């Protein structure tokens, strides 16, 4: 059976962050919801790439449970997630199932927010690591992915391909992801 | 006074080869047209992620000319940019005026179509190759980024940065790529 995934879309968020998981991760054969934080309408992006969701996140709530839940950076798009109830909820829920969260540039923001992982490595876009280790709940980590058990981080657009391919074989293992890579032509 | 960029989309775009150009020539401050081959609507990319365009095609060619035409790939886009009249009247203007055109994947199986930039060294997607080449107009290169003169390729997904700053150099000049480069994390 398909692994499945939701991606939650906030205006803000940094569109190569949101569409190169989303793309990547259909790619490897996830079923990947793209779910938008506000409603079901067009989301502007941090660079003003509009992206219409699959569904509004309350409606994708309904069709869980996720074996990941990915949340894009963007400064902006990373505190409409940290403000959210409902991304409260879902990632509390998704933290208690023992399944994966996924997080990228200023995305793990979220996660501190709402009170996740905490005692985890993590990595940040550099300068989102002050925000990021108020308090010092993480550890603090300057790999390009950081994976410790079901929290996984990485920094930046540029960190973007592998981040996903490490979601990719977080949920469909080393061999899929590694085929799904060859034709991306990376280096 | 800024440059600007027009970026051709059509179904069945590589979403990838859409957002990573729009999103770091955005950072580069190029004033940067989405534009829709169909028309106003949205657009359904090769990996089912829908962008909104900021305009048909029919009105952003009123408003140009622009610094660089940007064709991505996807087979399906490309075929669709391949086909349209639309698309080989701005790329003959383009080529006419001696303006930059950037194409990546199966992107540059357009130029082909539309008899754009022959004698040029080009790269492809290792997979469109041989539809590039046939007949022999166009001298292969395995460059990642390739440029000759006023006709800039690139291979697929992942060489969507190394591109997408190519341009940015050419427009913009090598330290502003520089400077739109670092807070990116690329390795």
Do not use: W
């Not at 991606?7 to 190169?20: P, S």
């Amino acid at each position: 059976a398909s692994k499945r995934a939701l991606v939650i879309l906030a205006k803000g968020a940094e569109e190569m962050e949101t569409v190169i998981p989303v793309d990547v991760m259909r790619r490897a054969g996830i079923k990947v919801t793209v779910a938008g934080l506000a409603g079901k309408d067009p989301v502007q992006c941090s660079r003003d790439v509009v992206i219409c969701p699959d569904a509004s996140l309350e409606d994708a709530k309904k069709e869980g449970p996720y074996d990941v839940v990915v949340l894009p950076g963007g400064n902006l798009g990373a505190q409409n997630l940290s403000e959210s109830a409902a991304v409260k909820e879902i990632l509390k829920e998704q933290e208690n199932r023992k399944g994966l969260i996924a997080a990228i540039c200023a995305g793990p923001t979220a996660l501190l927010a709402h009170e996740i992982g905490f005692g985890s490595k993590v990595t940040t876009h550099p300068l989102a690591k002050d925000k990021m280790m108020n308090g010092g709940h993480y550890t603090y980590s300057e790999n390009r992915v950081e994976k410790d058990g079901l929290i996984l981080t990485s920094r930046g657009p540029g960190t973007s391909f592998e981040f996903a391919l490490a979601i990719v074989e977080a949920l469909n293992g080393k061999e899929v992801a590694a085929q799904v890579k060859a034709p991306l032509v990376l280096k």
